[PDB]
Design a protein around this ligand. Structure first.
Ligand SMILES: CCCCCCCC/C=C/CCCCCCCC(=O)OC[C@H](COP(=O)(O)OCCN)OC(=O)CCCCCCC/C=C/CCCCCCCC
Ligand SMILES: CCCCCCCC/C=C\CCCCCCCC(=O)OC[C@H](COP(=O)(O)OCCN)OC(=O)CCCCCCC/C=C\CCCCCCCC
Ligand SMILES: CCCCCCCC/C=C\CCCCCCCC(=O)OC[C@H](COP(=O)(O)OCCN)OC(=O)CCCCCCC/C=C\CCCCCCCC
Ligand code: HEC
Ligand code: HEM
Ligand code: HEM
Ligand SMILES: CCCCCCC[C@H]1C(=O)O[C@H](C)[C@H](NC(=O)c2cccc(NC=O)c2O)C(=O)O[C@@H](C)[C@@H]1OC(=O)[C@H](C)CC
Ligand SMILES: C/C=C(C)/C=C/C=C/[C@H](OC)[C@@H](C)[C@@H](OC)[C@@H](C)CCc1oc2c(O)c(OC)cc(OC)c2c(=O)c1C
Ligand SMILES: CCCCCCO[C@@H]1O[C@H](CO)[C@@H](O)[C@H](O)[C@H]1O
Ligand SMILES: CCCCCCO[C@@H]1O[C@H](CO)[C@@H](O)[C@H](O)[C@H]1O
Ligand SMILES: CCCCCCO[C@@H]1O[C@H](CO)[C@@H](O)[C@H](O)[C@H]1O
Ligand SMILES: CCCCCCO[C@@H]1O[C@H](CO)[C@@H](O)[C@H](O)[C@H]1O
Ligand SMILES: CCCCCCO[C@@H]1O[C@H](CO)[C@@H](O)[C@H](O)[C@H]1O
Ligand code: FES
Lengths: 73, 241, 98, 66, 49, 365, 99, 32
């Protein structure tokens, strides 16, 4: 795979600035945090539930194990 | 029983990430091992030379080694013989083999202590709790001859009788030899014995942290610098119409 | 030629001549108290010689044999009930049963 | 000669958690000892007591050691 | 017409010193490059150590 | 160059694409520290354990090389699991050749790490060698013969340790060669990306974009490795291996290295010898089936919410299995472990393929 | 309303947030590549830009303003007629190969 | 001014954090 033989592209214009003309951390916080919150809210419903389940099974199972070895659960 | 009692966390002076061992405590701990534990426990991987620059001067360690007699040879006649110990010798073994060790301890085998702190969950917290934790069996518990009740030992029945108590030995610096003091010191010595690299890894750790604190932000700045070309680029689609 | 050469190399990984030298072992029953399971090293693995109690013997006698995965009556596994002798190696994957 | 450990243990078992556990232990003691034949023992009760007490001991004992 | 093509505004990304279109940026070029060079030299020495 | 410099790369790959290089680094780290450990290690059962303590106590910096090797093995697996996870989530497995070589690499690293763990001849060393080799005894008619052939006797002994040193020494280099093939196959297609959509219309040079990201990643990996080596070298290890091997006694709470716990739990969940060994083997080999189970019209899970939920359920389940593998075989852990084992296979073989079809219908294709 | 879950799923899927149309996300196998090759210039060029715009957004971990999101109601398959014929042709060759 | 300064400064910090615990700190009590 080599530049020049990848694929066909027509009518696209790309504008760029030298890295020396710009900031490396533009709006790092004033925008970074808000986007992180967006991305977090955006996935938490897909990611978190299964782990909350793990957490529950773990605490229940661990406590169940403890109680089971005692005289008076 | 199958019940378990886990040791609490003692605030060892070497607990902290950048906290070294207390070498005076290592020195006292060695005295405990020498006078008390060595009669039953071996420490096969430690030699008198290892003590030099850690808790004793070279002259002191040489003197400690000369206190014992070790086998050497064969000589010109093909005979083995005894000589004063020296820095290169490893601590004497109390028994020639584990069979003899068990025979001298009602069937129980005192394990080698070189790595005991690393070979047990809880490390020195476990050893300290064990050493200072002997008590009378709870009502209903009857131990076979030769076994002692210790809540910290798995199963609670151990073949080692309480090895320490007040004044079991006299320290070279006058420190009151109470049971807890003796345990605290021998546990510290055992930490050094199992991990002699302890102090050095932490010193290196500090330098590693200082170096990463420098390099990571810099390389990250290099990353952001290069990527800024892509991060701020704009696109336009101008198809002929 | 190839069959011979390959089997010679394969053969080299099999137990060497010094490993195959085996012999029996004599055990002193008096040294083993009632209730004690004693382990010995024999032919490479643990050898259990356990002095059983009346209760243990009776418990083993009461087992409903047709429900065992490996059906055998206790009396088909011992010569003298007070003594059970076994190779101390779990038949699953080789560990030593406690 | 007095081991700080004795002093600290005494102060620590004054805590509510330890007294409670001690009471459960003593209760087990009476129950088990009053029996000729039984397979119960008070290991559980004792361990509960030692766990509560030693957690406390561990928090102050070293202030008395060199 | 290709002449209808104007570079979009990049003022939200530009370093402060190159925000004035009526000023030459050559006066700050040395400082802007000197910093990056400092960052690269310091990393090299860190890694060498 | 044709492995770096002008290699076209997607403009949008994330940090999940950093693990391939971290794996290469882990392998080089292991080979280097390993070679230096081999310069002092002796494989005789009477001297193995002692030679390791000698390395840590008297060889200059022997302790850091030893613990970097031990913890390096752990970092290797953390990276392996992240790498495989990335592949599953993004549908990278559709690069069949690259993926299948990938499966071989995973199996070879597991075998290599297993044999390495046997070298110090501690209690875990001896029993791990006993149990893992005996997995072959599950093979009908010739199983037992194969085990004894591998051991070089009727039990794990001298002949076993010496050949394990030899196998552990050479396998890593074979892994290196196989890894290079893994990369040659990948270069034929180029990398996949988070959207799962062809990135041919937006490629950027590997250098400087990903060479700098890879370096940053390397630094973070080194930070993680040294935090373990310098501040908590035994954290991920087992205290029982600090005790010399004793062929007459298996520790009562014996357990596998952490990165093998999930597989251990699966095998322990089945009260049948052959069944457990088959489940164990399938728990890894099922990876080779994933490509055939792909039902979605889209490559990546990025745009597939249902698949995503099931994916994270699979991760949570592996975490569940890892936890169970570290607990005793007692209630309620036995049942949880069995449910977790069943769910593992149910998710991969039934639920995910089914969700893909459901998603397809919802998009009307 | 299956249609209700559908619009809900469409948005949850979220390729619309990158300005992509459903066919822009199809996994390319040999049938799909041939279908794409048969697209008229305008549809091919539109496809290329939507994909390029999406990859760019993805690189920046950003999404388009809500008013530019592809709408469930307006998303139509531009690829279907071409892909269907490509599959039909292949199936025909396969039947002849069977004789 | 790196390896020298860095090493000395770090060693200084380390020794300060562990004042009186290291062998170099108690050595005088046992030692030409
Ligand atoms: C990567 C490839 C490695 C795979 C190995 C394949 C082996 C290649 C075949 C070698 C062909 C050369 C001819 C050798 C003729 C030797 C005659 C022979 O085998 O005599 C038998 C005799 C057994 O005698 P007994 O103990 O009385 O019988 C026991 C009852 N079964 O065995 C021998 O002499 C073994 C000597 C082996 C020498 C060969 C070594 C070379 C090894 C091969 C690897 C290299 C590649 C060679 C290329 C192939 C060229 C044809
Ligand atoms: C292979 C890469 C792994 C890097 C390992 C870093 C390491 O071993 O630390 C080296 C060293 C620590 O200080 P020393 O002078 O070596 O210790 C003496 C203190 N009296 O520097 C670092 O930590 C570099 C950062 C990485
Ligand atoms: C082997 C068993 C080992 C034990 C298991 C322990 C697992 C511990 C869990 C650690 C996982 C932490 C990572 C969580 C990341 C959270 C996150 O960002 O999720 C959402 C995020 C959204 O991304 P997009 O859909 O592409 O859209 C981008 C929008 N801007 O999803 C991702 O980042 C996907 C990345 C998946 C890789 C994770 C892999 C974790 C490990 C799994 C093990 C692998 C499975 C099989 C191995 C066994 C053989
Ligand atoms: C002989 C009279 C002993 C003296 C003196 C000390 N120990 Fe000991 N110890 C002895 C035996 C027979 C055993 C085996 C106990 C068993 O039932 O297995 C032990 C064991 C220990 C252990 C190991 C406990 C474990 O978790 O397995 C430790 C950590 C221990 N001993 C420490 C120790 C120390 C520091 C001593 C001096 C202060 C000491 N022991 C003296 C026999 C004897
Ligand atoms: C010694 C171990 C391994 C090494 C050194 C290694 C290395 C690499 C490298 C360098 C890449 C490119 C960068 C990246 O995308 O991460 C890559 C890609 C890939 N590897 Fe591995 N790999 C290893 C093991 C595996 C395993 C275990 C699997 C899967 C069972 C696998 C599957 C893949 C796939 C499918 C890709 C393409 C990823 C994509 O572009 O989306 N690899 N690997
Ligand atoms: C894929 C790469 C490798 C992996 C995953 C790996 C893993 C391991 C593991 C898990 C151990 C046990 C560590 C312990 O707890 O003591 C080990 C030991 C060992 N390895 Fe490796 N290893 C690798 C490569 C190598 C190589 C290339 C060599 C030699 C050329 C080597 C030499 C050793 C030696 C001598 C030991 C015994 C000393 C010790 O236990 O630390 N290893 N290895
Ligand atoms: C001669 C040159 C050979 C150089 C060989 C190494 C190579 O090809 O280096 C590359 C940079 C490679 N990385 C990639 O292809 C790669 C592709 C996409 C994204 C990222 N990173 C972030 O998005 C990558 O890092 C990568 O890390 O592979 C190692 C695994 C190879 O190493 C090996 O195969 C041995 C262990 C040897
Ligand atoms: C000559 C070379 C040979 C024979 C190599 C064969 C290698 C086979 C596999 O790798 C490909 C294998 C390592 C891999 O199976 C997929 C692992 C996940 C196996 C996991 C595993 O570990 C254990 C372990 O580590 C132990 O340690 C103390 C103890 C163990 O039980 C007591 C186990 C155990 O019960 C299992 C299932
Ligand atoms: C912690 C104290 C529990 C009491 C158990 C001690 O038990 C005693 O140990 C002696 C060891 O010399 C034996 O000789 C004696 O027969 C035995 O009854
Ligand atoms: C069907 C079993 C075949 C297993 C391959 C090795 O087979 C063995 O090779 C040795 C060396 O030639 C022979 O001496 C031995 O008798 C033979 O069984
Ligand atoms: C980086 C965070 C990893 C999880 C920390 C706990 O790690 C666990 O600690 C136990 C007790 O020390 C060990 O026995 C166990 O093997 C280890 O995995
Ligand atoms: C993740 C779901 C947790 C698993 C719950 C296991 O639950 C246990 O199952 C045993 C089966 O014999 C029962 O005997 C026991 O009473 C029950 O509590
Ligand atoms: C992946 C989990 C599937 C659950 C079905 C989601 O169902 C959706 O939930 C939304 C939020 O309340 C509603 O606004 C929407 O009308 C409903 O169809
Ligand atoms: S239960 Fe598996 S080896 Fe015994």
């Amino acid at each position: 795979r080599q530049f020049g033989h990848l694929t066909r592209v027509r009518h696209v214009i790309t504008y760029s600035l030298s890295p020396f003309e710009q900031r490396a951390f533009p709006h790092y916080f004033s925008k970074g945090i808000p986007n992180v919150l967006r991305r977090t809210r955006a996935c938490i419903l897909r990611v978190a539930p299964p782990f909350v389940a793990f957490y529950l099974v773990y605490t229940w199972g661990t406590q169940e194990f403890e109680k089971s070895k005692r005289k008076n659960p | 029983s199958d019940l378990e009692l886990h040791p609490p966390s003692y605030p060892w002076s070497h607990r902290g990430l950048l906290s070294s061992l207390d070498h005076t405590s290592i020195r006292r701990g060695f005295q405990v091992y020498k006078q008390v534990c060595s009669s039953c426990h071996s420490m096969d991987y430690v030699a008198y030379r290892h003590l030099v620059g850690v808790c004793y001067t070279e002259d002191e360690a040489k003197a400690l080694a000369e206190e014992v007699e070790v086998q050497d040879g064969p000589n010109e006649d093909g005979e083995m013989f005894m000589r004063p110990g020296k820095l290169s010798d490893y601590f004497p073994k109390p028994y020639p083999n584990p069979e003899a060790a068990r025979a001298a301890n009602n069937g129980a085998l005192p394990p080698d202590l070189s790595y005991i702190v690393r070979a047990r969950h809880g490390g020195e917290d476990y050893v300290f709790s064990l050493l200072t934790g002997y008590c009378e069996p709870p009502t209903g518990v009857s131990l076979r001859e030769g076994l002692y009740f210790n809540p910290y030992f798995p199963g609670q029945a151990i073949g080692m009788a309480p090895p320490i108590y007040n004044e079991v030995l006299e320290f070279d610096d006058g420190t009151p030899a109470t049971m807890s003091q003796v345990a605290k010191d021998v546990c510290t010595f055992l930490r050094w014995a199992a991990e002699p690299e302890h102090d050095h890894r932490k010193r290196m750790g500090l330098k590693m942290l200082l170096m990463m604190g420098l390099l990571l932000p810099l390389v990250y700045a290099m990353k952001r610098h290069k990527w800024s070309v892509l991060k701020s680029r704009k696109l336009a689609y101008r198809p002929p119409k | 030629a190839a069959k011979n050469v390959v089997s010679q190399f394969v053969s080299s990984m099999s137990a060497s001549a010094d490993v195959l030298a085996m012999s029996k072992i004599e055990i002193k029953l008096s040294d083993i108290p009632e209730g004690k399971n004693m382990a010995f090293k024999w032919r490479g693995k643990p050898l259990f010689v356990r002095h059983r109690t009346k209760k243990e013997i009776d418990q083993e006698a009461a087992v409903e044999v047709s429900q065992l995965r490996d059906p055998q009556h206790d009396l088909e596994r011992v010569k003298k009930p007070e003594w059970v002798i076994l190779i101390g190696v779990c038949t699953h994957l080789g560990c030593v049963p406690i | 000669l007095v081991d700080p450990l004795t002093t600290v243990r005494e102060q620590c078992e004054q805590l509510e958690k330890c007294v409670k556990a001690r009471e459960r232990l003593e209760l087990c003691d009476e129950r088990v000892s009053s029996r000729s034949q039984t397979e119960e023992d008070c290991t559980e009760e004792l361990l509960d007591f030692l766990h509560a007490r030693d957690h406390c001991v561990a928090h102050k004992l070293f202030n008395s050691l060199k | 017409s290709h002449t209808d093509i104007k570079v979009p505004d990049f003022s939200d990304y530009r370093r402060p010193e190159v925000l004035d279109s009526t000023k030459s940026s050559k006066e700050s070029s040395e400082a802007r490059k000197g910093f990056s060079y400092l960052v690269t030299a310091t990393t090299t020495v860190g890694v060498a150590y | 160059n044709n492995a770096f410099i002008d290699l076209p790369a997607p403009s949008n790959i994330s940090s999940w694409w950093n693990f391939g290089s971290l794996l290469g680094i882990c392998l080089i780290l292991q080979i280097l520290t390993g070679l230096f450990l081999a310069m002092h290690y002796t494989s005789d059962t009477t001297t193995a354990f002692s030679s390791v303590t000698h390395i840590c106590r008297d060889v200059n910096y022997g302790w850091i090389i030893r613990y970097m090797h031990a913890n390096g093995a752990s970092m290797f697996f953390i990276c392996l699991y992240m790498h495989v996870g990335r592949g599953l989530y993004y549908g990278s497995y559709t690069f069949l050749e690259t993926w299948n070589i990938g499966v071989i690499l995973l199996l070879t690293v597991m075998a290599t790490a297993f044999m390495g763990y046997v070298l110090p001849w501690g209690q875990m060393s001896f029993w791990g060698a006993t149990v893992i080799t005996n997995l072959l005894s599950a093979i009908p008619y010739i199983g037992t013969n194969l085990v004894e052939w591998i051991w070089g006797g009727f039990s794990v002994d001298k002949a076993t340790l010496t050949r394990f040193f030899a196998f552990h020494f050479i396998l890593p280099f074979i892994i290196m060669a196989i890894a290079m093939v893994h990369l040659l196959f990948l270069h034929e297609t180029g990398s996949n990306n988070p959207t799962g959509i062809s990135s041919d219309v937006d490629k950027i040079p590997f250098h400087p974009y990903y060479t700098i990201k890879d370096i940053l990643g390397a630094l973070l990996l080194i930070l993680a490795l040294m935090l373990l080596v310098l501040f908590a070298p035994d954290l991920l290890g087992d205290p029982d291996n600090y005790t010399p091997a004793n062929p007459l006694n298996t520790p009562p709470h014996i357990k596998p290295e952490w990165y093998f716990l999930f597989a251990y739990a699966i095998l322990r969940s089945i009260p049948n010898k052959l069944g457990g060994v088959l489940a164990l083997a399938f728990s890894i080999l099922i990876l080779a089936l994933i490509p055939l189970l792909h039902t979605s019209k889209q490559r990546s899970m990025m745009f597939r919410p249902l698949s995503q939920c099931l994916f994270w359920a699979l991760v949570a389940d592996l975490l569940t299995l890892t936890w169970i593998g570290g607990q005793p075989v007692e209630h309620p852990y036995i049942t949880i472990g069995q449910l977790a084992s069943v769910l593992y296979f149910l998710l991969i073989l039934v639920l995910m393929p089914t969700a893909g079809t459901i998603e397809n219908k919802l998009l009307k294709w | 309303w299956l249609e209700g879950i559908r619009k809900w799923y469409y948005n949850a899927a979220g390729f619309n947030k990158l300005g992509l149309m459903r066919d822009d996300t199809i996994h390319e196998n040999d049938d799909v590549k041939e279908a794409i090759r048969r697209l008229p210039e305008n549809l091919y060029d539109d496809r290329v830009f939507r994909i390029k715009r999406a990859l760019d957004l993805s690189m920046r971990q950003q999404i388009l303003p809500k008013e530019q999101w592809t709408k469930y109601e307006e998303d139509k398959s531009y690829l279907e007629p071409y892909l269907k014929e490509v599959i039909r042709e292949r199936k025909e060759r396969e039947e002849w190969a069977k004789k | 001014f790196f390896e020298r300064a860095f090493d000395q400064g770090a060693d200084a910090i380390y020794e300060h954090i562990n004042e009186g615990k290291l062998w170099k700190h108690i050595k005088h009590k046992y030692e030409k």
